């Protein structure tokens, strides 16, 4: 196997993917904008577009139609898997990167001459494998053939509304179970959570004693939830980057 | 009000007219021969020539005319003003439009005397039109020069074989 | 088409390194198989592609690509932007053309005043 | 610590939800019901509708003549 061909096909596929997620970012700029905005508040350095662009939902001159949340998120997770593929290919590629032989192979190319068949399926099956609306007959499902079995409802509950809200009622229940009473209302519970927005309150004005078992367990479960929710609602941002950032800040 | 022109009588058998439509009938009245209107005075006429009906009948006649009428090639080099008078008009009014060429049959002329040959007319907004007689039935009439790219511009002739050096104001045609 | 594809891509593989092995093969064998070598044969064009591509693989051999997620995203955004720009150029062009059609259709081709009687592609550039 | 920083990064969502809570809370029966209906519909709806737009980008004849002449009037020869 001539590595040249393999590395070629790799660079080509990478190109295809970049082109796909670029077409996406084109039809609905929000996809990037949304993402980028969040990124802005995690990695302060990040440069973000002109506000006007964001609002008018335009990238250059044309203002694009506003899309609903479920679709934006969907395409963001699709682009997520795309970027995964890309990262993989980039990896394998990094790990992979006369005349008598020319006639030698050209001779064997004569093999099986009677192969009556039309072959238009290398760049078309890929281009197609990664494009908008690749599932239905013509135009029914925005999802590409690549991620045809991608379903957000298996990632978000109904009360979260694809990142609009985070369902904390459950944790209010567990909390009631933790404080061993009922003096605590959903709103008073949220008032409790607010402590964790401050850099010092959750530490110096704790709801319960921070050495209490029930409390520490609860806090664990809740923390896990908030984190998974975070990365769930912002697929496009590099999860590992954020994780490592936080860890280093911690140490 | 007439600006001194002699508006001719309808029977006089045609001195290019300022316009060319207005006449005077066997009586003395003034008439548009396009629109078949009768006018009392020069003041009325200038209202008509500036009117929306006399606009239309020119367009209708416009269409009505526009629906009927290894070798050697020719090359023309037309030069234009050197920023002498074009300094007073720069309001992006077709200023971006380059000169245009068209092949006209002599079958139609202001005098209609002799005819039977073609002319390679070249036109630009301010400057006056220009013509070049083409006795040869066909010269340089090529066959798929470029690889069929479709920006019609005005016509196959213009895109196919014209160049407009707009920076120097030189129009080449071949 | 697997045959054609394979021969194009192979002669393209070799043509990418030396360009001398094919020019010798053509004179040695004499087969109507490599008829795509001449720019006459349509497929030739796609050939010019493949070779280029292979020529490209020779570019960063010994160099790894270390693009990160952030970067890839930024890039795809910039590509989008480009596409939008190009689209705008196309639009403008269409407009100008429209103007031209209007004026051409709207000038007197009977205001004659003649005088006498009787490669540009490389010229319509700049140098 | 993670709960801390992640909740900080999600301040907008936290606020958004707290708001939601207060709203639903101040609803009536019918109101709360219809709202729930809405959340549900949003949940079980196609991400792309058969009635969406593609390519709707923004930026940044002789009528009385045929009646007068008597044409374009329905008639029949048997």
Curated annotation (Swiss-Prot), chain A:
It is found in: Nucleus. Signal peptide: none annotated. Present with 3920 molecules/cell in log phase SD medium. Belongs to the CWC complex (or CEF1-associated complex), a spliceosome sub-complex reminiscent of a late-stage spliceosome composed of the U2, U5 and U6 snRNAs and at least BUD13, BUD31, BRR2, CDC40, CEF1, CLF1, CUS1, CWC2, CWC15, CWC21, CWC22, CWC23, CWC24, CWC25, CWC27, ECM2, HSH155, IST3, ISY1, LEA1, MSL1, NTC20, PRP8, PRP9, PRP11, PRP19, PRP21, PRP22, PRP45, PRP46, SLU7, SMB1, SMD1, SMD2, SMD3, SMX2, SMX3, SNT309, SNU114, SPP2, SYF1, SYF2, RSE1 and YJU2. mRNA splicing factors, PRP9, PRP11, and PRP21, are necessary for binding of the U2 snRNP to the pre-mRNA in an early step of spliceosome assembly. Belongs to the SF3A3 family. This is Pre-mRNA-splicing factor PRP9. The chain holds residues 1 to 265 of 530 of the full protein.
UniProtKB/Swiss-Prot annotation, chain B:
A zinc finger (Matrin-type) spans 30-60. GO terms for molecular function: RNA binding; zinc ion binding. GO terms for biological process: mRNA splicing, via spliceosome; spliceosomal complex assembly; U2-type prespliceosome assembly. Its main location: nucleus. GO terms for cellular component: catalytic step 2 spliceosome; nucleus; Prp19 complex; spliceosomal complex; U2 snRNP; U2-type prespliceosome. Disulfide bonds: none annotated. It is found in: Nucleus. Keywords: Metal-binding, mRNA processing, mRNA splicing, Nucleus, Spliceosome, Zinc, Zinc-finger. Belongs to the SF3A2 family. mRNA splicing factors, PRP9, PRP11, and PRP21, are necessary for addition of the U2 snRNP to the pre-mRNA in an early step of spliceosome assembly. Present with 3460 molecules/cell in log phase SD medium. Belongs to the CWC complex (or CEF1-associated complex), a spliceosome sub-complex reminiscent of a late-stage spliceosome composed of the U2, U5 and U6 snRNAs and at least BUD13, BUD31, BRR2, CDC40, CEF1, CLF1, CUS1, CWC2, CWC15, CWC21, CWC22, CWC23, CWC24, CWC25, CWC27, ECM2, HSH155, IST3, ISY1, LEA1, MSL1, NTC20, PRP8, PRP9, PRP11, PRP19, PRP21, PRP22, PRP45, PRP46, SLU7, SMB1, SMD1, SMD2, SMD3, SMX2, SMX3, SNT309, SNU114, SPP2, SYF1, SYF2, RSE1 and YJU2. Interacts with CUS2. This is Pre-mRNA-splicing factor PRP11. The chain holds residues 34 to 253 of 266 of the full protein.
UniProtKB/Swiss-Prot annotation, chain C:
GO terms for cellular component: catalytic step 2 spliceosome; nucleus; Prp19 complex; spliceosomal complex; U2 snRNP; U2-type prespliceosome. The chain holds residues 89 to 228 of 280 of the full protein. Its main location: nucleus. It comes from the Eukaryota. mRNA splicing factors, PRP9, PRP11, and PRP21, are necessary for binding of the U2 snRNP to the pre-mRNA in an early step of spliceosome assembly. GO terms for molecular function: RNA binding. The gene is PRP21. It comes from Saccharomyces cerevisiae (strain ATCC 204508 / S288c) (Baker's yeast). This is Pre-mRNA-splicing factor PRP21. It is found in: Nucleus. The keyword Acetylation does not apply. GO terms for biological process: mRNA cis splicing, via spliceosome; mRNA splicing, via spliceosome; U2-type prespliceosome assembly. Signal peptide: none annotated. Present with 2490 molecules/cell in log phase SD medium. Keywords: mRNA processing, mRNA splicing, Nucleus, Repeat, Spliceosome. SURP motif repeats lie at residues 7-47. Belongs to the CWC complex (or CEF1-associated complex), a spliceosome sub-complex reminiscent of a late-stage spliceosome composed of the U2, U5 and U6 snRNAs and at least BUD13, BUD31, BRR2, CDC40, CEF1, CLF1, CUS1, CWC2, CWC15, CWC21, CWC22, CWC23, CWC24, CWC25, CWC27, ECM2, HSH155, IST3, ISY1, LEA1, MSL1, NTC20, PRP8, PRP9, PRP11, PRP19, PRP21, PRP22, PRP45, PRP46, SLU7, SMB1, SMD1, SMD2, SMD3, SMX2, SMX3, SNT309, SNU114, SPP2, SYF1, SYF2, RSE1 and YJU2.
Curated annotation (Swiss-Prot), chain D:
It is found in: Nucleus. Signal peptide: none annotated. Disulfide bonds: none annotated. Present with 3920 molecules/cell in log phase SD medium. Belongs to the SF3A3 family. Belongs to the CWC complex (or CEF1-associated complex), a spliceosome sub-complex reminiscent of a late-stage spliceosome composed of the U2, U5 and U6 snRNAs and at least BUD13, BUD31, BRR2, CDC40, CEF1, CLF1, CUS1, CWC2, CWC15, CWC21, CWC22, CWC23, CWC24, CWC25, CWC27, ECM2, HSH155, IST3, ISY1, LEA1, MSL1, NTC20, PRP8, PRP9, PRP11, PRP19, PRP21, PRP22, PRP45, PRP46, SLU7, SMB1, SMD1, SMD2, SMD3, SMX2, SMX3, SNT309, SNU114, SPP2, SYF1, SYF2, RSE1 and YJU2. mRNA splicing factors, PRP9, PRP11, and PRP21, are necessary for binding of the U2 snRNP to the pre-mRNA in an early step of spliceosome assembly. This is Pre-mRNA-splicing factor PRP9. It comes from Saccharomyces cerevisiae (strain ATCC 204508 / S288c). The chain holds residues 319 to 424 of 530 of the full protein.
């Amino acid at each position: 196997m001539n590595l040249l061909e393999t590395r070629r096909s790799l660079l080509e596929e990478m190109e295809i993917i970049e082109n796909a997620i670029a077409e996406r970012i084109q039809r609905n700029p929000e996809l990037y904008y949304h993402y980028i905005q969040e990124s802005s508040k995690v990695f302060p350095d990040t440069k973000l577009p002109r506000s006007s662009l964001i609002a008018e939902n335009k990238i250059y001159k044309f203002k694009k139609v506003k899309r609903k949340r479920k679709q934006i998120i969907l395409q963001q997770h699709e682009i997520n898997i795309f970027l995964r593929d890309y990262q993989e290919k980039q990896q394998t590629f990094n790990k992979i990167n006369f005349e008598r032989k020319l006639q030698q192979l050209e001779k064997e190319l004569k093999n099986e001459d009677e192969n009556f068949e039309l072959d238009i399926n290398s760049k078309k099956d890929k281009y197609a494998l990664f494009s908008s609306s690749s599932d239905p007959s013509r135009r029914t499902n925005i999802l590409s053939d690549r991620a045809r079995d991608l379903d957000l409802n298996e990632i978000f509950t109904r009360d979260e509304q694809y990142g609009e809200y985070m369902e904390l009622e459950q944790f209010h229940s567990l909390w009631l179970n933790v404080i061993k009473r009922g003096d605590c209302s959903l709103l008073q519970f949220l008032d409790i959570l607010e402590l964790f927005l401050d850099d010092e309150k959750y530490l110096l004005t704790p709801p319960m004693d921070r050495k209490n078992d029930r409390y520490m367990a609860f806090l664990l479960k809740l923390s896990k939830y908030v984190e998974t929710f975070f990365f769930k609602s912002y697929a496009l941002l590099d999860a590992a980057a954020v994780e490592n950032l936080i860890k280093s800040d911690f140490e | 009000l007439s600006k001194g022109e002699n508006v001719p009588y309808t029977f006089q058998d045609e001195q290019v007219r300022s316009n060319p439509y207005i006449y005077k009938n066997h009586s003395g009245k003034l008439v548009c021969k396009l629109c078949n209107t009768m006018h009392m005075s020069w003041s009325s006429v200038e209202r008509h020539l500036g009117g929306k009906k006399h606009g239309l009948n020119v367009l209708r006649r416009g269409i009505s005319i526009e629906k009927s009428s290894g070798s050697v090639g020719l090359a023309i080099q037309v030069n234009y003003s050197s920023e002498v008078k074009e300094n007073s008009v720069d309001s992006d009014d077709k200023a971006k439009v380059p000169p245009l060429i068209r092949i006209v049959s002599g079958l139609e002329l202001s005098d209609t005397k002799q005819k039977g040959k073609k002319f390679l007319v070249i036109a630009y907004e301010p400057f006056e039109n220009i013509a070049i007689e083409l006795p040869p039935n066909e010269i340089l009439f090529s066959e798929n020069n470029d690889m069929d790219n479709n920006n019609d511009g005005v016509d196959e002739l213009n895109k196919k074989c014209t160049f407009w050096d707009a920076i120097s104001k030189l129009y080449y045609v071949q | 088409s697997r045959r054609d594809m394979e021969v194009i891509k192979l002669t393209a593989r070799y043509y990418a390194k030396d360009k001398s092995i094919v020019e010798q093969m053509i004179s040695k064998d004499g087969e109507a198989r490599l008829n795509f070598m001449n720019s006459s044969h349509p497929l030739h064009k796609t050939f010019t592609d493949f070779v280029a591509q292979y020529k490209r693989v020779y570019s960063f051999t010994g160099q790894e690509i270390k693009k990160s997620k952030r970067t890839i995203l930024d890039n795809c955004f910039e590509r989008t932007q480009y596409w939008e720009f190009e689209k705008d150029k196309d639009r403008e062009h269409d407009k100008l053309v429209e103007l031209c059609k209007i004026q051409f259709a709207a000038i007197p081709w009977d205001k004659f005043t003649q005088v006498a009687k009787f490669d540009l592609e490389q010229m319509r550039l700049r140098r | 610590y993670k709960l801390h920083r992640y909740l900080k990064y999600l301040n907008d969502e936290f606020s958004r939800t707290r708001s939601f809570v207060e709203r639903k809370l101040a609803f009536t029966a019918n109101e709360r019901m219809a709202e729930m209906d809405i959340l549900t519909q949003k949940y079980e709806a196609p991400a792309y509708d058969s009635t969406e737009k593609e390519g709707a980008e923004q930026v940044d004849m002789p009528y009385w003549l045929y009646k007068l002449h008597g044409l374009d009037r329905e008639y029949r020869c048997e």
